[PDB]
Structure formats: structure tokens, C-alpha cells
């Protein structure tokens, strides 16, 4: 796993005596083989917050299908105010994506994808929306078995 921090936010709760601050850190974790996950953790110091997120993240792994170093088809993720469409790109074109949507595509091990975030730009929701799109994504052999066909017949 090759964790990459995304945002470190400094939140505060006001108490009768004043304000008590905290740090929330968003971390994306994955290996380049095709598994990726994200997690969040709140603490009182930045190094403490990061450790919690990495521990949390390692329990939410998801799998990405990556035919020919690319995603199979185009999907649109959707979580709350965040929306992100992913579209396959031609070989050697690199990863064309924003801030926190690029982190989950480089960690996942994908090489050639283009995308565009059409909704809000909150980092917490741009990672949920991307992972939601990863769910709707499906390979040819997986579809062929479901429909009782053969991969040759489909294509």
C-alpha cells in the first residue's frame, strides 16, 4: 500500500471557555495492482490524524477493472453534491483528472483515464463520487456470464 494524503483540515468546536481545535486528515490508500480505498480520521495533531486514516482506509478496499490499461466503459459517479464522470482514453495519454479524483486513479494503478467533476468540489465528496463510479464498472467476461452469452458473441 502506498498511502497519499489529500487534505488536512483544521476544525474547531466552541466551548464555554473558547474554541478547541482539531485536525481532520483525508487519506487514499492502494496498491498499483487494482485495489484502492479511502479513509478519514480526526485527532489533535497532524501526525496522529494521518495514522488513524490509514488504519481506517485499509478496511474499505475496492477493486477496479482495468482492461488494456484502461477502464472498460464510461461511468458517472454520484454522491451528494459531488459528481464525476470517467471516460476511457487512448493508450499513452496519461491521467487527466482533478485534485482528489487523480489520487484514487493513480493509486488504483490505472494509466489512461480522462474525467471531469461536474458537481461541487469538496474533497470528501469527490472521493466518494469516484468510488461510486468504480462500483458501476464491469468487465466483458463478467457481463457475458450474466447474460448467458460468450465474450466472442458479445463483441
Amino acid at each position: 500500500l502506498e498511502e497519499r494524503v489529500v487534505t488536512i483540515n483544521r476544525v474547531a468546536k466552541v466551548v464555554k471557555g473558547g474554541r478547541r481545535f482539531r485536525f481532520t486528515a483525508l487519506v487514499v490508500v492502494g496498491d498499483k495492482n487494482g485495489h484502492v480505498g479511502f479513509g478519514t480520521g480526526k485527532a489533535q495533531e497532524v501526525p496522529d490524524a494521518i495514522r488513524k486514516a490509514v488504519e481506517d482506509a485499509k478496511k474499505n478496499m475496492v477493486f477496479v477493472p482495468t482492461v488494456d490499461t484502461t477502464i472498460p466503459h464510461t461511468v458517472v459517479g454520484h454522491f451528494g453534491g459531488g459528481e464525476i464522470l470517467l471516460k476511457p482514453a487512448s493508450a499513452g495519454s496519461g491521467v487527466t483528472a482533478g485534485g482528489p479524483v487523480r489520487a484514487v486513479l493513480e493509486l488504483a494503478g490505472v494509466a489512461d483515464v480522462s474525467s471531469k467533476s461536474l458537481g461541487s468540489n469538496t474533497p470528501i465528496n469527490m472521493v466518494r463520487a469516484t468510488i461510486d463510479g468504480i462500483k458501476q464498472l464491469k468487465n466483458a467476461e463478467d457481463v457475458a456470464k450474466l447474460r448467458g452469452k460468450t465474450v466472442e458473441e458479445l463483441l
Binding site: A91, G92, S93, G94, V95, T96, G99, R102, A111
Partner: protein, 199 residues
């Protein structure tokens, strides 16, 4: 040549040896300037891509307006964009002269191609950007193929890459075939060049 300035500090800022291996990073392998012995910093996404374009264009020492132009015409070729963009750079007249061992450094080959000391197919070429093709006899002018500098630069030089055939007796060479992206240094992540030029 065109960047008429110090060469060690260019490598030290970027962190790789642009002139072979370790020659300019033996002592003080850190960025130039007042700082550098003090501390380092954290590189952003912009700084990661912009630090690899500068690894190529300072390796061959050609300006930006020419670096960008040759990036577009590599984008009309068969294959992958970054793959093709790096074999065009290897194919300039400067690099081909440097590969054969006629010059110690590209800043010396360029100052050699500039003055007309080399001939391609029996004709003078006074320019360093000549994009040589496959199977062209690269030779030396039959007026200065005895200069001490070029002779001292062959024995003191390295071996020869596979895709060029050279005769130290006849002072001739030729590009037998185009490389396939694994023959050169390959220390540059070519994907960051392509991403950089689309920001």
C-alpha cells in the same frame, strides 16, 4: 552554445547527472544557492510535472519554443505520444554526433556541428537541429579530420549504443534503426511531460 553558463548547478537543482554519471554530484549533492544545505521542501503536483520537463530540455539543452514545437509534431506519429517524443530528441544531429563519440559533451558536439566540421552524405551541415534519418553516412569534413580535440575525445570516451555503427578509422557513422524507448537513460517519467502540456 545557447545556455552559456554553468552546468553543474543545473544537475544539482534537478538532482540527476545530465553529463553521464555522478560527475557533478560527488560533492554537495543538493540544490544550488544560499540554501540547500539548510533543508528541503515538499513538491506539489505542479512541481512534480514541471521538474521533469526541465529534466529533458536541459539534457539536450534546447530552448522552450523549440521544445514545444517538436512535442506537437511527435503527436502526429504512430504509437504513444511520450514514446515518440523522446526518439525524436535522440535523432537530432547533436545527439547523433555525441553518441558516436566525436565529442565529450553535447555542448561540444553542438559547437562542432555549428562550425561545419561534419558532413552528411558528402554535404556540409552548419546547424545542430538537423533531424537525421535512417542510414545516412555521418562523416567529418576532409579538412579537419585530424584535430587533436576530436581524436582525444574518442579514446577518453565510452562505448557505442547499438543503434549506431561507427568507424574510428573511417570517421563515419549511420543510424541503423530508430530506438524503442529502452535504449536511452530512461530516468525521465515520460508520462509527466505529456500531462504537463495539457494542464
Amino acid at each position: 552554445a545557447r545556455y552559456t553558463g554553468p552546468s553543474w548547478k543545473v544537475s544539482r537543482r534537478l538532482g540527476i547527472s545530465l553529463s553521464g554519471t555522478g560527475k557533478e554530484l560527488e560533492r554537495r549533492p543538493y540544490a544550488p544557492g544560499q540554501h540547500g544545505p539548510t533543508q528541503r521542501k515538499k513538491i506539489s503536483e505542479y512541481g512534480l510535472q514541471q521538474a521533469e520537463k526541465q529534466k529533458l530540455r536541459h539534457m539536450y539543452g534546447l530552448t522552450e519554443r523549440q521544445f514545444k514545437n517538436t512535442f506537437n509534431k511527435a503527436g502526429k506519429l504512430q504509437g504513444k505520444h511520450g514514446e515518440n517524443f523522446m526518439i525524436l530528441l535522440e535523432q537530432r544531429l547533436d545527439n547523433i554526433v555525441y553518441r558516436l563519440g566525436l565529442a565529450r559533451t553535447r555542448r561540444a558536439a553542438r559547437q562542432l556541428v555549428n562550425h561545419g566540421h561534419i558532413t552528411v552524405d558528402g554535404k556540409r551541415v552548419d546547424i545542430p537541429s538537423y533531424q537525421v534519418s535512417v542510414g545516412q553516412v555521418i562523416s567529418v569534413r576532409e579538412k579537419s579530420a585530424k584535430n587533436s580535440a576530436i581524436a582525444e575525445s574518442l579514446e577518453v570516451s565510452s562505448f557505442v549504443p547499438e543503434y549506431v555503427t561507427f568507424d574510428a578509422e573511417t570517421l563515419t557513422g549511420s543510424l541503423n534503426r530508430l530506438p524503442e524507448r529502452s535504449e536511452l537513460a530512461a530516468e525521465i517519467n515520460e508520462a509527466f511531460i505529456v500531462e504537463f502540456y495539457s494542464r
